[PDB]
């Protein structure tokens, strides 16, 4: 919910910065001169940057060796069909490259197989000047490397086509991460319109980073493969380590936990990693069931949680959610819900992004007005 707190950083800024330098007069000549004897060399450009440059396809050599004796003459010798089909096979990659650049106007994401094959991506990702642990992480999970990469059209001139691929750099490895899921916590009185609700707005990923906690408010953007959480620090907040204190005492004075309030008590369910949170309200009927045994549990009004052991589907009203059958141990912490401590006559239910301190001071101001 806190996605509006991010700063608007241009992701393609580095790639377009390198691309702009290559547009300067003479830089393409330097790229050709440095790549003259080898397939990979680091070139120092006018900006002072040193970027590794690689050549991935040379259709010039193929054409100038095989097709010049055939099509560049008056008395054309008849080519074999093997040459024709080999030419389509070799040129197909360039046709898909140009098609993707045409459709996406020269900035493509994710990096497709035509932008960079997996063998060339593995070679280039091993050739980066980085630590061995980073190389191991990158090589074992190249698909998320593709999903977090851009390919930027740069130049086409002097018989040279160039596009700048922009691989991610994972500067943080194996720090502990945890995902916070949140469901609306509401009262359960029988009167329809007297209900008040409270929802923690700080749902999303958290990962340790250099003595602070990187909070990622958009959980859908972060990819998860098995036990590993692939996130981006560009769309992240930096938070003090007091943010951990919200999960054990939401009323702690060191860090004000962020919540939103309303009065729309809707029956909803949040499928967590190892269970399901169901918040059944009003006259809605909510149950958790086993695929073979039928209904095994019925939820009373309020906030409740069911483990993934035994349960295969969960139904809340007319919508059915499937629970994750991941292996793992789940714990239920009994406690009085915090919504019962608020006076319904003075509860401020008009906040879209607030905190416990803001709600408390608003309640205090409302009591002072009385």
């Amino acid at each position: 919910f806190l996605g509006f707190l991010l700063g608007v950083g241009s992701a393609i800024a580095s790639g377009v910065a390198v691309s702009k330098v290559l547009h300067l007069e003479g830089e393409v000549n330097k790229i050709k001169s440095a790549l003259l004897s080898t397939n990979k060399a680091v070139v120092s450009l006018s900006n002072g940057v040193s970027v590794l440059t690689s050549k991935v396809l040379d259709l010039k050599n193929y054409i100038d060796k095989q097709l010049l004796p055939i099509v560049n003459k008056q008395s054309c010798s008849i080519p074999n069909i093997e040459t024709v089909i080999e030419f389509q096979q070799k040129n197909n990659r360039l046709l898909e490259i140009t098609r993707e650049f045409s459709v996406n106007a020269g900035v493509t994401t994710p990096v497709s197989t035509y932008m960079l094959t997996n063998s060339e991506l593995l070679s280039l990702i091993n050739d980066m000047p980085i630590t061995n642990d980073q190389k191991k992480l990158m090589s074992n999970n190249v698909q998320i490397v593709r999903q977090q990469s851009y390919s930027i059209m740069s130049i086409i001139k002097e018989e040279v086509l160039a596009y700048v691929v922009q691989l991610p750099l994972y500067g943080v490895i194996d720090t502990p991460c945890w995902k916070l899921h949140t469901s609306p916590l509401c009262t359960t009185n029988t009167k329809e319109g007297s209900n008040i609700c409270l929802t923690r707005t700080d749902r999303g990923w958290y990962c340790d980073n250099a003595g602070s906690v990187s909070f990622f408010p958009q959980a859908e953007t972060c990819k998860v493969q098995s036990n590993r959480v692939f996130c981006d620090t560009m769309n992240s907040l930096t938070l003090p380590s007091e943010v951990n204190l919200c999960n054990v005492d939401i009323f702690n004075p060191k860090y004000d936990c962020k919540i939103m309030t309303s009065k729309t008590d809707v029956s909803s369910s949040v499928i967590t990693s190892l269970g399901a949170i169901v918040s059944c309200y009003g006259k809605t009927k909510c149950t958790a069931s086993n695929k073979n045994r039928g209904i095994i549990k019925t939820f009373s009004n309020g906030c409740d949680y069911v483990s993934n052991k035994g349960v295969d589907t969960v139904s809340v009203g007319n919508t059915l959610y499937y629970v994750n059958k991941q292996e793992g141990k789940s714990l239920y912490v009994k406690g009085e819900p915090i919504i019962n401590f608020y006076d319904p006559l003075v509860f401020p239910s008009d906040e879209f992004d607030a905190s416990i301190s803001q709600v408390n001071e608003k309640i205090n101001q409302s009591l002072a007005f009385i």
Partner: antibody, heavy 121, light 112 residues
């Protein structure tokens, strides 16, 4: 002009270890790498091992693996090659040849003047 | 791994006559990124070697136009148009396509 100025000749006892330096001048060393090659007298030229000053990757010929270790100190623009446990047949001249900073086609464009390491009883 | 055999083991030459050195290869040198990488080096007696030819039929900077490369695929040949006093030495061909790079037998040229 780019030249590769190497160390002088060394005479040592069998079983000890050598260090051969190949100083590079005229270019940014961090943008390339150095491959050492052995040239025994009356014998051809054999590639020993490639080390990049850019990423620190290493590769060694299978006949030499284990005994060979290269360290590059880009802050002094000189690359060292250490050969532990010399045998009798390792009396040779060691040439350093420039190479790309990544796994790609070999260049060997610039060659050092050599370092004659001889082991005799 | 690949091995190259440099066929003309000895080079008796006469001044003003051309000389050719050929070295066959056990595999095709076409890399996936399609260039053939075979280079020729010249080594003077008691001096450091220097590259002459960097790709097939390509001449390195500072090398005189007398040296010229030729061939493609698996048969490569270096042709010296005229032999002089400053051409005495040994020549090596080297492939960069496959690890490890290898060198020829080091054929020697001697003026008659």
């Amino acid at each position: 002009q780019v030249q590769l100025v190497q160390s002088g000749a060394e005479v040592k006892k069998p079983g000890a270890s050598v260090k051969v330096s190949c100083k590079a001048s005229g270019y940014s060393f961090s943008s390339f790498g150095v491959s050492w090659v052995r040239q025994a007298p009356g014998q051809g030229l054999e590639w020993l091992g490639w080390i990049s000053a850019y990423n620190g990757n290493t590769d060694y010929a299978q006949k030499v693996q284990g005994r060979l270790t290269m360290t590059t100190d880009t802050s002094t623009n000189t690359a060292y090659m250490e050969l532990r446990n010399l045998r009798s047949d390792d009396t040779a001249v060691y040439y350093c040849a420039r190479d790309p900073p990544a796994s790609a086609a070999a260049m060997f464009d610039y060659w050092g003047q050599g370092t004659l390491v001889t082991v005799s009883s | 791994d690949v091995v190259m055999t440099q066929s003309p083991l000895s080079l008796p030459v006469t001044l003003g006559q051309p000389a050719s050195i050929s070295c066959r290869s056990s595999q095709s040198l076409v890399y996936s990124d399609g260039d053939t990488y075979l280079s020729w080096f010249q080594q003077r007696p008691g001096q450091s070697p220097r590259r002459l030819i960097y790709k097939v039929s390509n001449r390195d900077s500072g090398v005189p136009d007398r040296f010229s490369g030729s061939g493609s695929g698996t048969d490569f040949t270096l042709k010296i148009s005229r032999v002089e006093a400053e051409d005495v030495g040994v020549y090596y061909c080297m492939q960069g396509t496959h690890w490890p790079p290898a060198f020829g037998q080091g054929t020697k040229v001697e003026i008659k």
